[PDB]
Write a structure and sequence with these properties.
Chain A: 40S ribosomal protein S16-A
Largest sheet of chain D: 6 strands, mixed
Strand order of the largest sheet of chain D: 3-2-1-4-5-6
Shape of chain C: globular
Number of strands of chain D: 6
Number of strands of chain C: 11
Helix content of chain C: 25-40%
Number of helices of chain D: 6
Largest interface: B-F, 11 and 10 residues
Entry title: Structure of Bfr2-Lcp5 Complex Observed in the Small Subunit Processome Isolated from R2TP-depleted Yeast Cells
Oligomer: part of a larger assembly
Organism of A: Saccharomyces cerevisiae
Structural class of chain C: alpha/beta
Order of helices and strands of chain D: EHHEHHEHEHEE
Distance between the termini of chain C: 36 Å
PDB class: ribosome
Order of helices and strands of chain C: HHHEHEHEEEHEHEEEEE
Keywords: Bfr2, Lcp5, Small subunit processome, ribosomal protein, ribosome
Strand order of the largest sheet of chain C: 2-1-3-4-5-10-11
Chain lengths: 125, 50, 282, 174, 78, 60
RNA sequence: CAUUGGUGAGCAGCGAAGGAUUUGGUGGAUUACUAGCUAAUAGCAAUCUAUUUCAAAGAAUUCAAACUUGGGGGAAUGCCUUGUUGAAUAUUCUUCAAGUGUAACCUCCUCUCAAAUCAGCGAUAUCAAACGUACCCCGUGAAACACCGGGGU
RNA sequence: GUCGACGUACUUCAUAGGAUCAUUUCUAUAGGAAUCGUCACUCUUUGACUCUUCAAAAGAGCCACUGAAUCCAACUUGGUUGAU
RNA sequence: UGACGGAGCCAGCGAGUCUAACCUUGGCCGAGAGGUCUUGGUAAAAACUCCGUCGGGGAACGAGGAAUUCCUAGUAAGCGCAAGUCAUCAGCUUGCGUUGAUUACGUCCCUGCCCUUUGUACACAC
């Protein structure tokens, strides 16, 4: 079959399953494209790993994300994690890893939640 | 009690052939045979002739 | 962690079933110790088996705090957590502070949008001794569950007669010293069990002249607890009440933690029973 | 291109046939006799053939009763005794102190019949002849063999006590 | 042990590596012929108990605070 | 009990940080809790693929 | 609609007198190359024998050694050690005992797993058929809105 | 009140006899069957060898030379008067 | 921080052959019991996004005094859903999700509460 790679994202009770395969440069979430994210103010939070990396690095990859659980804010944060993990897991497997290293550095210089999700764990004093 | 004690590192050698749905629960075929998952073109050509 | 707590709970529960089989052999080995010293008759079944006869040459070198608390009985000071049920009212927010104030080495963290698996994972993380969560009924409190954390026993109580310190006056401030404990009229096997499930909630070794006393009265199948301060006068000790009066009675005692709700019920209150009204601790 | 987990070839001690102890590699229901009721065994008719053991012989000498006309008093019908070759071999294996009872046993009026056993046990032969035929009547005076023949139906047993014999399972006691 | 990425192909016979063959018996003496090698002596207390050759590793490195150097505690020493 | 020896010898099994290749290793009662599969391995990928759980950012 | 499942029919594109897999055998490396043999300061390599024997050197644990034993209990016959009769100018064999002596011997443990598969019992279910209900049609019949049979939904 | 005694109640204590095996012959009995220098054939049992299934995991790795299969592309032959 | 409708889509805990009203008007059948039909009365995901239409109460009461209480991060607060666990709870209780902040995170100045005032626990320092 075609090359593929699969990552996971996690906010409070919302999970994201993103599959990244070689293709025509199309971006899909739940069948719908990315220009139809319903919270409508957080739509720039899911374009956010797209525009930090430059749109040329998504021109030949495909992204298909399912999301279940959570609400609205927790769902959008799951999509931006799974896209950013899905891009950086494709590039560590079939593309240059120095490309992966510059892709990873461009995310952790911005924000750590795009790569791994900090579990907001309780603490007793 | 078996759910809480899964030990998520087990391997039994049927993890290849047995598949799971995307929701999480496992799937089993209606035919159940290990040979009638689909049909080849030589079988389909003969069966449509019959 | 999660494998470790699953591993040591397996080794503990097998060791519980091992001494269950060993209790007959320990009882039989008592007879060998008596008969070798005083009393020449040896019974019939112990007379034949030469395996036990060669067993005693080793087993002559053998010889109560509860076994879940045996390691941590006095080697460490118990840090404990008081929590509310869910979306607390103002009254038990005051009352959880008073339970935290009655209990040395206690903290009070509010519970809101937590889940009980994630709470007990957090107290197994940071390391605490036991948790006291409180339910209520329109202000006044009704339930109080004490659950010891390293897969220790939990004990759920029901409390009715609650009068608290914030209701009456501006009486001052509580003592907050390491308190003396007064335990009275506990006689049953569950009585000694409920002593050790609750005595370990205080710090080890209070002072010789500690100035507050917390009594636990068993007068009539209700463990009734009050807190008092005292002096020693020239002719008689005077006492004065402070802190919450309780009329508390346990209704279940599961061997697992409070997270489980399917664990081994060591004891449960039975009330639809012909002899339920007859006696106590049943 | 070796295999993995190579182990030295040794003796498969529960498996091989070169040992002595691993050299090991039709329902049967015996019908009841067709001449037997629930408990009758209607084929018991005169004349009768008694099976005799030593405890019958030695007690009859002790109680002053000769066999052939002594059998006449209790069973009351015509009967001739027969002694197996196994029994008379072990009866005369008692030795010198019962040779007068030996002499009363060997007699032209006491019939004799042959045997086929790799042994000399009186109790095992008498039971096996009884099981295969349910035809004979048995004379016995010890509780071990008496309980063994009381547990098979339709087999009349007799013993001795007091001054004469006594039959147990016969319907025609008089 | 781990000095080479590419092991030599003239050391595997049709069974067993040639240098893994226990060659202590060909020695003429007694004390080195004595094998007290325990089965699970991975980083034990001696070297006669090892039954293998020691593995190479470095386990603690610190820079020198004075003279532009750094010292690494190795299998070969320091 | 034999297929474990096959997986240990092929270099799949670790005790904490390091994998051990000698199958004659006595594991301590305390140390029994920590024996997992090694990372980035095909012995772990099949295990997670049945569960549909493969997070290949950690290249598991 | 997705198939991130298989099997087949093609196209775009890649495309210098073919191209994909898959595999046996051999050779060279996989540590840094001073040549073969022998009785070796030399000879042979087409050989060391009708030249390879003599001489010289060469003897302490004065008559020394399991540093290599699964554990418990013994050890009759064994074996070891120490005391008990007879050959010779202080002495080889042998008379019999004692060993909290013994790697010869003789017993018990050194196996029965907090473990898995396999078989029986089978639930969650699932596929096909039959049967039952309702509504239509057809067959037999002279006929009975058929009591007789069949088909369909 | 921890026990004593008495009373009472419960539980427990002996089974015999025959046969076989176990001493590198002989378990002690003469009431029992086994002393041979193999030739072949048949039938099962067990193990090894080479592949292989449940089902993969891992390749003492690189390069060169010279061969064996399989599917295409192309060529030939047969084929609608009938190929699979 | 409104009202009116119209779309957009997001949850998790739940599932014992167990799940769940009352009163009344009649008709027919029945020997009754009652059955069948008839009729009327009484009680019983949100948030958010977006699209358009909109611009004082029938005496007490227009966001609540003094005085007090609680609270530090997935917290306070807001929102719904589910269950009713041998105690307690339906005038409610307990769970489970969605949204998710401000402000300290220092100090012993005040109020308290406790400890210490031979360093004895082995060096150096003090």
């Amino acid at each position: 079959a075609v090359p593929s790679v699969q990552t996971f994202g996690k906010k409070k009770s919302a999970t994201a399953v993103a599959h990244v395969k070689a293709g025509k440069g199309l971006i899909k979430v739940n069948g719908s494209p990315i220009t139809l994210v319903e919270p409508e103010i957080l739509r720039f939070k899911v374009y956010e790993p797209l525009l930090l990396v430059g749109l040329d690095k998504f021109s030949n990859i495909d992204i298909r994300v399912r999301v279940t659980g959570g609400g609205h804010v927790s769902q959008v944060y799951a999509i931006r994690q799974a896209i950013a993990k899905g891009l950086v897991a494709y590039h560590q497997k079939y593309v240059d890893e120095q490309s992966k290293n510059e892709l990873k550095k461009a995310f952790t210089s911005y924000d750590r939640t795009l790569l791994i999700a900090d579990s907001r764990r309780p603490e007793p004093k | 009690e078996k759910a809480k004690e899964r030990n998520p590192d087990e391997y039994y050698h049927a993890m290849h052939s047995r598949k799971t749905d995307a929701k999480g629960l496992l799937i089993s075929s209606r035919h159940g045979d290990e040979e009638d998952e689909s049909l080849s073109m030589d079988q389909v050509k003969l069966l449509k002739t019959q | 962690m999660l494998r470790r707590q699953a591993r040591e709970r397996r080794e503990y529960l097998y060791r519980k079933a091992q001494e269950l089989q060993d209790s007959q052999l320990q009882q039989k080995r008592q007879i060998i110790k008596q008969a070798l010293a005083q009393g020449k008759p040896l019974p019939k079944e112990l007379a034949e088996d030469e395996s036990l006869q060669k067993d005693f040459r080793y087993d002559q070198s053998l010889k109560q705090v509860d076994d879940e608390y045996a390691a941590t009985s006095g080697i460490m000071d118990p840090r404990i957590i008081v929590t509310t049920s869910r979306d607390p009212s103002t009254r038990l927010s005051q009352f959880a502070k008073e339970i935290k104030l009655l209990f040395p080495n206690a903290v009070r963290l509010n519970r809101g949008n937590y889940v009980m698996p994630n709470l007990v994972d957090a107290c197994k993380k940071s390391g605490t001794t036991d948790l006291v969560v409180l339910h209520e009924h329109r202000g006044v409190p009704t339930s109080l569950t004490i659950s010891h954390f390293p897969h220790g026993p939990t004990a759920q109580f029901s409390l009715h007669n609650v009068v608290m310190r914030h209701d009456i006056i501006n009486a001052g401030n509580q003592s907050e010293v390491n308190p003396h404990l007064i335990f009275d009229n506990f006689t049953t096997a569950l009585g000694k069990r409920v002593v050790c499930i609750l005595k370990h909630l205080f710090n080890a070794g209070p002072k010789k002249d500690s100035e507050r006393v917390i009594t636990f009265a068993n007068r009539g199948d209700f463990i009734s607890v009050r807190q008092h301060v005292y002096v020693r006068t020239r002719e008689g000790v005077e006492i004065a009440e402070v802190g919450p009066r309780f009329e508390m009675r346990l209704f279940e005692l599961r061997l697992g933690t409070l997270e489980n709700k399917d664990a081994d019920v060591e004891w449960q209150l039975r009330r639809f029973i012909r002899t339920a009204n007859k006696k106590d601790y049943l | 291109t070796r295999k993995f987990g190579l182990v030295k070839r040794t003796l498969n001690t529960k498996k091989d046939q070169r040992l002595k102890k691993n050299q090991e590699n039709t329902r049967n229901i015996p019908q009841v006799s067709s001449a037997l009721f629930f408990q009758y065994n209607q084929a018991i008719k005169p004349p009768y053939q008694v099976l005799i053991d030593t405890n019958f012989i030695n007690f009859s000498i002790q109680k002053k009763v000769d066999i052939v006309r002594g059998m006449m008093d209790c069973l009351l019908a015509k009967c001739n005794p027969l002694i197996t070759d196994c029994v008379m071999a072990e009866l005369e294996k008692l030795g010198p102190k019962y040779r007068i009872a030996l002499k009363l046993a060997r007699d032209p009026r006491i019939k004799r019949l042959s045997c086929s056993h790799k042994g000399t046990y009186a109790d095992d032969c008498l039971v096996h002849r009884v099981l295969q035929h349910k035809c004979y009547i048995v004379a016995t005076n010890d509780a071990g063999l008496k309980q063994r023949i009381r547990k098979i139906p339709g087999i009349p047993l007799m013993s001795v006590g007091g001054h004469a014999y006594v039959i147990e399972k016969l319907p025609d006691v008089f | 042990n781990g000095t080479l990425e590419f092991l030599n192909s003239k050391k595997m016979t049709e069974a067993g590596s040639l240098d893994l063959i226990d060659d202590a018996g060909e020695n003429s003496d007694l004390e080195d012929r004595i094998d007290n090698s325990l089965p699970g002596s991975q980083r034990g207390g001696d070297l006669s108990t090892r039954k293998m050759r020691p593995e190479v590793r470095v386990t603690s490195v610190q820079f020198s605070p004075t003279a532009n150097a750094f010292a690494a505690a190795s299998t070969e020493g320091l | 009990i034999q297929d474990a020896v096959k997986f240990i010898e092929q270099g799949h099994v670790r005790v904490g940080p390091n994998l051990i290749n000698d199958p004659a290793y006595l594991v301590t009662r305390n140390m029994e809790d920590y024996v997992t599969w090694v990372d980035n391995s095909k012995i772990k990928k099949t295990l997670l693929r049945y569960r549909n759980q493969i997070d290949d950012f950690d290249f598991s």
